[PDB]
Design a protein around this ligand. Structure first.
Ligand SMILES: Cc1nc2cnc(Nc3ccnc(N4CC[C@@](C)(C(N)=O)C4)n3)cc2n1C(C)C
Length: 301
């Protein structure tokens, strides 16, 4: 029927890695900043360790996420580095030093220009088009689930809902009939773009989740962000059509945003644009430090 999933689930020893500090704590559990020094490899890989109370059902949920996360390999998608079989069960992931895009745009508004915004859109569309190739429906795309490796490199994450509720990011078919397609992820992509273009605003702020279904049914949509030209807003609007097949395809979104990213100032109007600066790996003290290699450069055992 379908193609066999030959992905390798890597089991890592507790002694092979160390927890440095806590990066975040939520519904899932706690994420730690860590270092992974494999076997006798003379490498130090900066990692993020996701950790869970212990219950059999919670372990199933974390192992389902590990399954999906180990099954992906794309420059714009977060891959699972391995798992550690403690009583708790820990997921070892790539350290994304700048955290989530949502908090990033909120904290750096005064230094984010049209080039970065448009490049981010291209990058998310690429990651999403890859998930579509792998026949994978995300079911939770949002600016909080896009992580920042460097200000110039972002990746899609959170496969806790990914298959083969976040109302304000969902397509109408999903809210009304629990239908989830790749075109339903396109609706979520539209909202994510709106979150970036507004510098991290909350979609439909003050409006309760039960009112959203009616609001969308009537024909109401998220407003035009002040920096958006009709060109960019038209794209957002198309991702929010009632007819799923009328919405753009991710491959088309790559093309559309790429054309626009070649002339950013023509599509986004930002006060003091281009005079803006963000940390680049060509900056002083951007990075013991000896033998530190990024996960993207550390391949196989
Ligand atoms: C503040 C912060 N700094 C981070 C550095 N690196 C990662 N690394 C990764 C890589 C892939 N996936 C994830 N996780 C974080 C928790 C997750 C379940 C989610 N909802 O974003 C996916 N973290 C996550 C980081 N965070 C989280 C808590 C948003």
């Amino acid at each position: 029927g379908e193609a066999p999933n030959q992905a390798l689930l890597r089991i890592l020893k507790e002694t092979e890695f160390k927890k440095i500090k806590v990066l975040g704590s939520g519904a899932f559990g706690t994420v730690y900043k860590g270092l992974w020094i494999p076997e006798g490899e003379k490498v130090k890989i900066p990692v993020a360790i996701k950790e869970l109370a212990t219950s059999p059902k919670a372990n199933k949920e974390i192992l389902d996420e590990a399954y999906v996360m180990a099954s992906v390999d794309n420059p714009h998608v977060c891959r699972l580095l391995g798992i550690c079989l403690t009583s708790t069960v820990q997921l070892i992931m790539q350290l994304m030093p700048f955290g989530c895009l949502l908090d990033y745009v909120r904290e750096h508004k005064d230094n984010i220009g049209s080039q970065y915004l448009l490049n981010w859109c291209v990058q998310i569309a690429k990651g999403m088009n890859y998930l579509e190739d792998r026949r994978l429906v995300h079911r939770d795309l949002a600016a909080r689930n896009v992580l920042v490796k460097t200000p110039q490199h972002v990746k899609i994450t959170d496969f806790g809902r990914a298959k083969l509720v976040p109302i304000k990011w969902m397509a109408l078919e999903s809210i009304l009939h629990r239908i989830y397609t790749h075109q339903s992820d396109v609706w979520s992509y539209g909202v994510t773009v709106w979150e970036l273009m507004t510098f991290g605003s909350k979609p439909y702020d003050g409006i309760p989740a039960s009112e959203i279904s009616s609001i969308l049914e009537k024909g109401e949509r998220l407003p035009q962000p002040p920096i958006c030209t009709i060109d960019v807003y038209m794209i957002m609007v198309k991702c929010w059509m009632i007819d799923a097949d009328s919405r753009p395809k991710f491959r088309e979104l790559i093309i559309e945003f790429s054309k626009m990213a070649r002339d950013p100032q023509r599509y986004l109007v930002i006060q003091g644009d281009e005079r803006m600066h963000l940390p680049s790996p060509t900056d002083s003290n951007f990075y013991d430090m000896d033998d530190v290699v990024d996960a993207d450069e550390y391949l196989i055992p």
